[PDB]
Amino acid sequence: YFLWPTSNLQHCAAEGRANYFGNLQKGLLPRHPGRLPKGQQANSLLDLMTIRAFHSKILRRFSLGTAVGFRIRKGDLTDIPAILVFVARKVHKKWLNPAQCLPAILEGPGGVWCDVDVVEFSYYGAPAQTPKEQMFSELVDKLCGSDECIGSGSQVASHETFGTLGAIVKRRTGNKQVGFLTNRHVAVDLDYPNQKMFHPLPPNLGPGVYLGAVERATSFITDDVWYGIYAGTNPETFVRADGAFIPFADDFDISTVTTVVRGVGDIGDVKVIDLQCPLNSLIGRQVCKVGRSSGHTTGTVMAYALEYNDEKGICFFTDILVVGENRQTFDLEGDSGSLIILTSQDGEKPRPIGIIWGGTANRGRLKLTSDHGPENWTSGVDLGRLLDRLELDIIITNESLQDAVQQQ
Amino acid sequence: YFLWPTSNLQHCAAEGRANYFGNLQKGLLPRHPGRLPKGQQANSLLDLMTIRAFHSKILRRFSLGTAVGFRIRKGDLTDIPAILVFVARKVHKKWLNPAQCLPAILEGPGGVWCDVDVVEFSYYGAPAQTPKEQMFSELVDKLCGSDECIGSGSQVASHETFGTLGAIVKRRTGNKQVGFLTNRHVAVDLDYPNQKMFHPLPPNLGPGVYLGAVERATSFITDDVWYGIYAGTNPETFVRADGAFIPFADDFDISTVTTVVRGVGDIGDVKVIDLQCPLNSLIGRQVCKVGRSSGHTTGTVMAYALEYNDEKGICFFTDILVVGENRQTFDLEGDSGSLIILTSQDGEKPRPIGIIWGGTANRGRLKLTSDHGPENWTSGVDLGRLLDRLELDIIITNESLQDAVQQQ
Amino acid sequence: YFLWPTSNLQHCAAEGRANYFGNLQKGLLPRHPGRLPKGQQANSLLDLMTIRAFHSKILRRFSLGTAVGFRIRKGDLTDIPAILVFVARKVHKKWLNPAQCLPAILEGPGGVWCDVDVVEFSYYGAPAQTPKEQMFSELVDKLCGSDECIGSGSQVASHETFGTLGAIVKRRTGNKQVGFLTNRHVAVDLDYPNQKMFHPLPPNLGPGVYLGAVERATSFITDDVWYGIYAGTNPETFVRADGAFIPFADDFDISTVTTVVRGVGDIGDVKVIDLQCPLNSLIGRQVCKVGRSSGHTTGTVMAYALEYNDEKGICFFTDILVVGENRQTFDLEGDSGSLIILTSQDGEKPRPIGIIWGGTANRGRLKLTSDHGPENWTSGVDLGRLLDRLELDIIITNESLQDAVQQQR
Amino acid sequence: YFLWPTSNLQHCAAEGRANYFGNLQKGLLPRHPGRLPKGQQANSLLDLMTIRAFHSKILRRFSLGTAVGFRIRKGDLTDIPAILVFVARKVHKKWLNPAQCLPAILEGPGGVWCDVDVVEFSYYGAPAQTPKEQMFSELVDKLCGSDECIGSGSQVASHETFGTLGAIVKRRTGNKQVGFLTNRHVAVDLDYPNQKMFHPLPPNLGPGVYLGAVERATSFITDDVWYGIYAGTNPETFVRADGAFIPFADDFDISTVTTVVRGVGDIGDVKVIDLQCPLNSLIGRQVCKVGRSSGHTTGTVMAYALEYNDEKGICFFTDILVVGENRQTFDLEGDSGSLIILTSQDGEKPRPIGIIWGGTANRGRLKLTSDHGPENWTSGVDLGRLLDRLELDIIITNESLQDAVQQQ
Numbered sequence A, B, D: 001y002f003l004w005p006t007s008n009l010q011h012c013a014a015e016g017r018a019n020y021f022g023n024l025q026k027g028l029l030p031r032h033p034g035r036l037p038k039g040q041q042a043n044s045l046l047d048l049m050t051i052r053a054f055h056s057k058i059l060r061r062f063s064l065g066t067a068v069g070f071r072i073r074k075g076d077l078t079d080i081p082a083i084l085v086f087v088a089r090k091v092h093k094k095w096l097n098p099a100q101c102l103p104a105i106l107e108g109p110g111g112v113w114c115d116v117d118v119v120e121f122s123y124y125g126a127p128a129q130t131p132k133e134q135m136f137s138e139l140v141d142k143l144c145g146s147d148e149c150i151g152s153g154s155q156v157a158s159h160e161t162f163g164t165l166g167a168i169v170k171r172r173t174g175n176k177q178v179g180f181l182t183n184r185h186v187a188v189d190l191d192y193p194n195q196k197m198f199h200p201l202p203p204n205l206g207p208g209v210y211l212g213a214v215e216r217a218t219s220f221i222t223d224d225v226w227y228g229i230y231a232g233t234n235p236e237t238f239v240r241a242d243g244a245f246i247p248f249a250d251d252f253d254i255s256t257v258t259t260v261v262r263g264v265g266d267i268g269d270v271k272v273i274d275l276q277c278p279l280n281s282l283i284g285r286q287v288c289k290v291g292r293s294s295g296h297t298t299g300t301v302m303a304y305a306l307e308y309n310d311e312k313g314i315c316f317f318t319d320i321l322v323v324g325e326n327r328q329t330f331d332l333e334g335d336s337g338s339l340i341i342l343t344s345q346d347g348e349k350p351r352p353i354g355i356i357w358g359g360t361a362n363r364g365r366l367k368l369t370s371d372h373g374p375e376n377w378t379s380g381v382d383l384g385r386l387l388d389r390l391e392l393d394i395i396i397t398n399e400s401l402q403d404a405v406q407q408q
Numbered sequence C: 001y002f003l004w005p006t007s008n009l010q011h012c013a014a015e016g017r018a019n020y021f022g023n024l025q026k027g028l029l030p031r032h033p034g035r036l037p038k039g040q041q042a043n044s045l046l047d048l049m050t051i052r053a054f055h056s057k058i059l060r061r062f063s064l065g066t067a068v069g070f071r072i073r074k075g076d077l078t079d080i081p082a083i084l085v086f087v088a089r090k091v092h093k094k095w096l097n098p099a100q101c102l103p104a105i106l107e108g109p110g111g112v113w114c115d116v117d118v119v120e121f122s123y124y125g126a127p128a129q130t131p132k133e134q135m136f137s138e139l140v141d142k143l144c145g146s147d148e149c150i151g152s153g154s155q156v157a158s159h160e161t162f163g164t165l166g167a168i169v170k171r172r173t174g175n176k177q178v179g180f181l182t183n184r185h186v187a188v189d190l191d192y193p194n195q196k197m198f199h200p201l202p203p204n205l206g207p208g209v210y211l212g213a214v215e216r217a218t219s220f221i222t223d224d225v226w227y228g229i230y231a232g233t234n235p236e237t238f239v240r241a242d243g244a245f246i247p248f249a250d251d252f253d254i255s256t257v258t259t260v261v262r263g264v265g266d267i268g269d270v271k272v273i274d275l276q277c278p279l280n281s282l283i284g285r286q287v288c289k290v291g292r293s294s295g296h297t298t299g300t301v302m303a304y305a306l307e308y309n310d311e312k313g314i315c316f317f318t319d320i321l322v323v324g325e326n327r328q329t330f331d332l333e334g335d336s337g338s339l340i341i342l343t344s345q346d347g348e349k350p351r352p353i354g355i356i357w358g359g360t361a362n363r364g365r366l367k368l369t370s371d372h373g374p375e376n377w378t379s380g381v382d383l384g385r386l387l388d389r390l391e392l393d394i395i396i397t398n399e400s401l402q403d404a405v406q407q408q409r
């Protein structure tokens, strides 16, 4: 059976959204000489997303998507909170018509103001789901079945597509069995009754071991349940929370599963993305990931809450937007599901924050410097939130690995 | 959010299937010395599937699919219970390997025997979800948006696909709302939260009106639940029962909905396919369906319980197999969701028995006559068993239609 | 281990061809521009072929190809010996510059003359390896595997190609082994070391029985060896005599082979094509063939010795040209190797004359009638000559087939 | 007028093949001493092939190809005699069921034994007729018409395909004709009655001079005739000995022919590949070639007698296997027919051992190192055995070119 709400998304959820922005458009103090009293400057992700949600009506016009974060000036990433507006071709102010040129400052409910930054930006197509790696290193070999262990970054293959093993997780409800976590597009086939996963390839392709089958997956969680707020005025707003849980099979040796992210080391617990924390603790932070296509790479969290409006009137959100450092691409086709791990803040081990999303528009390009060409951007989703909606707890040590084995 | 059996539901259901056959296996009880003790001749559908499921190993050995029905000797259909074994190309025994030659009589549990027929038979692919080929008539004209009412046969369209409305159904339990029934592949999309239906076209493709959204759908149901017995030795056995229920929108005029099959007339309640009934009460019966692609097309039921072992070790079952009578096709691409109705024979109401299926093993060909080329066949889903899973009831009179809409 | 003749064999043959055609010109004493005696009109295929070979200079210049036969006038065959000239698009005289145009009569060596008929012509692409056979009748079903026996018309398949069993034959010399004849393109693959035949499909494509492997075949024969005469001025002229002989394996049930042409009946021995015989005894004759692809069709022998000069100065000849009757096609793709058989006209048994060639770039369209579209033509290899160069003998009665098995060494 | 062996001769050869291995199986008496002795280890390439031909049943199980040579541990060639088994993907031993896993040692008849090395392998498919993506150097320009002479490496071309001249060879008997040697696919073609050669292009493609026409070619030689022993259990074994001899035209200016392999220098006579000599005489020896597409390239002989069984059932053998140096490619598409030469070790003249084979699977890919991508390999036929079967003799000095041209 499949189910969708009957009267939930009509005149119970839309009127709650129509109530949220109803008040807003009465109690407004224009205050637009361009002085902007600095005590109402955005401080966290929640402030930036609330201003964008209010002014989303004038943001959709002549723009193919928006996001929140810091303003990018001359390629470099500043530490000024701004709303990133993505345009197809960024031209000089003189060649724009007045009704197209975006403002530099936007003020929202309660005088909360922020900057507006235009960024040349484009989307990629869907991956073809059996990609080429093109990274030749001793790590990719280990990741693609040449290693004697299965861990974060190892290639996981369904009957038609393969990706990467994000993390080793265990359930919370009842039997709380132990498995691994990846995104929905790697381990789920709607037109197929079961979803058997293999390492490194399924039997019809080559040699491999049977890892198990998907027990639960999510595709679409609304914005009010994902973030907890109304991220946009569109009543059909969804957050692409693609993730699939595959518990290790009964006739499968779990002792061949390591918890160390090969190429990174021992990692810490999941770091929740708190929408009220200062933006600099997530925006601009140096992250890394270990998948198979691209081995071990490192990048930068450029923006959050990437909003895209598809052909019809449905708003789709994606949580994380990472851009690789040193002009290197952060990921490649086939790194879907990889663990997004923020580099270790001084002492404590690195903590993961997301998994690489693998949907149609999971990758793309955007130009930062005029001296170089466009650079690839990689999209991710909130790990702390996905683990909440999948009832999964991450495993971080090999000793905790043996404890859940005798816990089912 | 989607769920799957944890594993244990499979582990403690696989044994029951093996335990079912192993029991009759140990005491083989041949009871067949070459000549078959008569009377043991299969009598109904259940008898035939029990012989095929017991001999599933040796039948799928050199076969692309099997189905139960009557033997087809020299093109015409007989009244002899047989297991139709589909081969890629039927040739003379003199050029056949002694091991690849299928037998004529197969023993069964307790001595229930039957014949074995060989049919040259092939498959097609997918209808690519927007078919352009169609018939031309005033009926099809009305069904594709020219009619002044919505009913069985009108064109339903998701955001990407074309289809045909099967029947105006009302839910049994719960809200007891009234909507329509069609194929799952017509109504449901994996990578989309909403499943909106329209007539005759979506707002992005052309003009139309909003009918509603899918409230429930079924994709795969196990054989022992769908039929009532283990129909094979493969522990991964499923039935392609793809149906979707779309309740009419709250702001929709039910007055423009009719419970009459345009081109067929007034119909009765659904004829439940009884596995204990004599074979000729469904096999050989002349049926008819009205969709959009082909319109009103009369056919004849040829086989039941079409088995299909894919290249990945999974068994699939499609219930009804229809071949267009008098050297014509029974349906075209886009008729997915039409009502398979039994033609009135002595004055009773034409009772519907199935709905046109959609997918990959959908519309292939088979050779019956020598003087003609291959003839198209069509897959179908058991309407009686589909309604007993979605918990729906078909409406037959416009006066009963208003009683259902007032009980919501 | 293949071999090719030496440059001496070429220059010896080369000058030999130059000498023959040269002495024709050296005494010509060209004639008056008036009447020609009826007694000197072309009478045989050899007359038409000699006149065409003499004027090969002015014929290949503005033509796709040429052939010998009767003049097609207003879409019908006449009794006028003529040299068919094939053009891509036949237009009125007013739109051709006189150098492009063609004369009505050609006068060959020795006062022998004939007509010149212009025909609109076109070639097709390559045969489809695995073609479509949309005939759908009981004869085709039996020819493709549903028959208890195997004979002329049965589908013979290599590991990647479908074909048609031409005739049950036996070798004249050697060990007198019994086999079957077919087209070379159907049964011969050169990038592979053996040519195994199967009826109806090879193991990698479906059920079937292993008939045997190709024991010998011929691709090209020179015109002076095939026709016996010099048919063209080009010293690089060859006849596409594509045939393959496949003797049944050491352990194959020959009792399942019949020498009956299903749909035609009992046939007689091969009707040899005599180049010095009258033209009407092969040109215009009604013929038939039983081919897997198209079943049993009937046609008309429209021309003979079809010439075609490719882009590298090589001249190629195909023997028979057949067009189906009643605006119908005579063959489809996959009928390659089917036995072209003269229909009985006065009680005699139907005797074959050729096999359908079916390869590289055979088959195409032919503009006969203006109110209709272009009709399909089909090429063929002279059966009488193909057996002479393959040293084969056609078996025509199942009684001769029984004894021919015992006469093997 | 082609001719093939009478099926009487085929059955006789198959019986002798079963009698050869039937003798090796009747005696046997393995009595393996556990780890086995060290003087019973193979030394010659004749002993390596007989171990593979004996164990060809178990080797074919899950191997696309096999080849004798040295064991490649960790990415490079060791001095251990081993039979290289080729797989599609080298996965760890833990992800392989014991039926598919390969043993490390194999003992054959007489107590001889050698190792087994697994190599990741793939075939490049059929190359191009008129190939592109070739090098640019003054050496390449001379080989493609810009030089005033023609010799080894010069561009020879039929009317459809390109290639290179292997060696200036003359017939041992007959008219003692003088010509050149090249690959069979480069020169000959089925659907023509004449194979005329040109340099650098045929008249239809561009400028060039008529060199000659193919007088003889051998398509396939059986392994018992080529090697002198049965190299496989399958009764259909053939060696891809594809060579052709093209004697110069009677009018061609033979003074423009040079016996100097431009790039290598003055070469010596053919180095017959002794099968009963220690493996280090061929395996590991550095080789070189002068082409056109690729020019002067060096390489390393990696294996011998590369066995490839297709899905139809035929076994095919290729003599020489060479990969490129410095992780480069040994040749490009278009180098078919160029003479492979053993580089001088002791300052002696270079000895040609093989010629580049130009059939469908003439090139391919294989992985050696984990930190780098897969390298390209090239096929070749035994030159000494090719000249023996074609009844030809290589000319190594321009003085012998005049002594050979006068004897005609």
Ligand SMILES: Nc1ncnc2c1ncn2[C@@H]1O[C@H](COP(=O)(O)OP(=O)(O)OP(=O)(O)O)[C@@H](O)[C@H]1O
Residues within 6 Å of the ligand: A062, A071, A072, A073, A074, A075, A087, A089, A090, A091, A092, A093, A094, A096, A100, A101, A102, A116, A117, A118, A119
């Ligand atoms: N709708 C639009 N479409 C295209 N270009 C636009 C649009 N609105 C503004 N721009 C361009 O973008 C400029 C503002 O870009 P942005 O806000 O990113 O500037 P910045 O961060 O101060 O500097 P930098 O461009 O170096 O990052 C405008 O001056 C104009 O040239």
Ligand SMILES: Nc1ncnc2c1ncn2[C@@H]1O[C@H](COP(=O)(O)OP(=O)(O)OP(=O)(O)O)[C@@H](O)[C@H]1O
Residues within 6 Å of the ligand: B062, B071, B072, B073, B074, B075, B087, B089, B090, B091, B092, B093, B094, B096, B100, B101, B102, B116, B117, B118, B119, C207
């Ligand atoms: N695996 C197979 N693949 C292909 N053909 C087969 C196979 N097994 C049997 N056959 C062929 O099919 C025949 C059986 O046909 P079938 O059981 O349908 O007979 P029928 O119904 O009496 O007659 P008909 O097929 O003429 O309607 C066998 O005699 C043989 O020629």
Ligand SMILES: Nc1ncnc2c1ncn2[C@@H]1O[C@H](COP(=O)(O)OP(=O)(O)OP(=O)(O)O)[C@@H](O)[C@H]1O
Residues within 6 Å of the ligand: C062, C071, C072, C073, C074, C075, C087, C089, C090, C091, C092, C093, C094, C096, C100, C101, C102, C116, C117, C118, C119
């Ligand atoms: N080189 C040429 N290319 C195209 N058309 C030509 C050429 N030479 C002649 N023709 C045309 O073909 C005509 C000759 O027709 P043809 O030889 O078929 O005679 P016919 O049999 O009496 O007539 P038809 O068959 O056309 O009724 C010329 O009158 C001229 O119009």
Ligand SMILES: Nc1ncnc2c1ncn2[C@@H]1O[C@H](COP(=O)(O)OP(=O)(O)OP(=O)(O)O)[C@@H](O)[C@H]1O
Residues within 6 Å of the ligand: A207, D062, D071, D072, D073, D074, D075, D087, D089, D090, D091, D092, D093, D096, D100, D101, D102, D116, D117, D118, D119
């Ligand atoms: N059928 C197979 N398919 C893929 N890999 C296999 C197969 N059988 C064995 N292997 C792999 O090959 C390994 C054996 O090593 P191999 O034969 O390559 O020797 P080696 O050259 O000394 O080793 P290395 O690969 O470290 O250089 C096994 O440990 C296993 O990982």
Ligand SMILES: [Mg+2]
Residues within 6 Å of the ligand: A071, A072, A073, A074, A117, A118
């Ligand atoms: Mg900027």
Ligand SMILES: [Mg+2]
Residues within 6 Å of the ligand: B071, B072, B073, B074, B117, B118, B119
């Ligand atoms: Mg039958």
Ligand SMILES: [Mg+2]
Residues within 6 Å of the ligand: C071, C072, C073, C074, C075, C117, C118, C119
């Ligand atoms: Mg004419």
Ligand SMILES: [Mg+2]
Residues within 6 Å of the ligand: C072, C073, C074, C075, C119, C367, C368, C369
């Ligand atoms: Mg005409």
Ligand SMILES: [Mg+2]
Residues within 6 Å of the ligand: D071, D072, D073, D074, D117, D118, D119
């Ligand atoms: Mg190795």
Ligand SMILES: [N+]
Residues within 6 Å of the ligand: D015, D016, D017, D019, D020
């Ligand atoms: N032998």
